[PDB]
Amino acid sequence: FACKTANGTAIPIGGGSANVYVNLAPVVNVGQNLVVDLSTQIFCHNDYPETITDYVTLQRGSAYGGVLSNFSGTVKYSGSSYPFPTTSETPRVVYNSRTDKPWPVALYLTPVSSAGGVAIKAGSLIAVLILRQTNNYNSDDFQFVWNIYANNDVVVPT
Ligand SMILES: CCCCCCCO[C@H]1O[C@H](CO)C[C@H](O)[C@@H]1O
């Protein structure tokens, strides 16, 4: 089991960390969602589906910078929605394919009432997402840590 980003940065068997750079809607109004769809940027696969089934959770999702300060968040994982920042580990998603498959994570971030102006700064860390991978074969319990950075400013009109 291993993962990679759309620009080809890989985290190998055993886990590790990688940076993910996301383009963001430049203008988001109070009452609208900023959507960070990581399923287009983060992909994983099973290296031995002939024999092994891999299990994948969102162990934890943390908010930083302007997302922490200025937004109210929800994370959708494989069709279900949870608070973001997270309060518990999600159920498992099964990976039984050697072909790259999206990590089905998306953030829905809506500005808090006090938000206004530059709510997210280009280059800033906005989230850390922890992918936890186990299997039905041995005792592997690996973390794939995804550091999410904004590619651009996000302005909340006032
Ligand atoms: C003849 C025995 C060959 C054993 C190969 C084990 C490969 O393990 C890796 O791939 C696994 C499947 O995705 C998940 C693991 O957790 C490792 O990621």
Give the range of the structural domain holding residue 49, as residue numbers without chain letter. Answer: 1-158
Residue of 52, 99, 101, 143 to mutate, ligand 1, most atoms within 8 A of C-beta: 52
**What is the total count of domains within the chain?**
1
CA distances from 53 to 10, 17, 28, 147 (A): 21, 22, 41, 26
Rg over CA atoms, the chain: 16
Q: How far apart are CA 21 and CA 7, in angstroms?
A: 9
Of 151, 130, 121, 132, nearest in space to 6 by CA:
151
Q: Which atom of ligand 1 is nearest to the CA of 13?
A: 18
Q: Are 156 and 70 in contact (CB under 8 A)?
A: yes
Q: How far apart are CA 46 and CA 25, in angstroms?
A: 33
Q: How far apart are CA 144 and CA 36, in angstroms?
A: 18
Tell me which residue has its CA closest to atom 10 in ligand 1: 1
Annotated resolution, angstroms? 1.9
Domain CATH for 137: 2.60.40.1090
DSSP 108: E
Q: Are 85 and 150 in contact (CB under 8 A)?
A: no
Q: Is the peptide bond before 85 cis (omega within 30 degrees of 0)?
A: yes
| Alpha-helical segments (H) within the chain | 65-70
- Tokens in use for 46? 């099973």
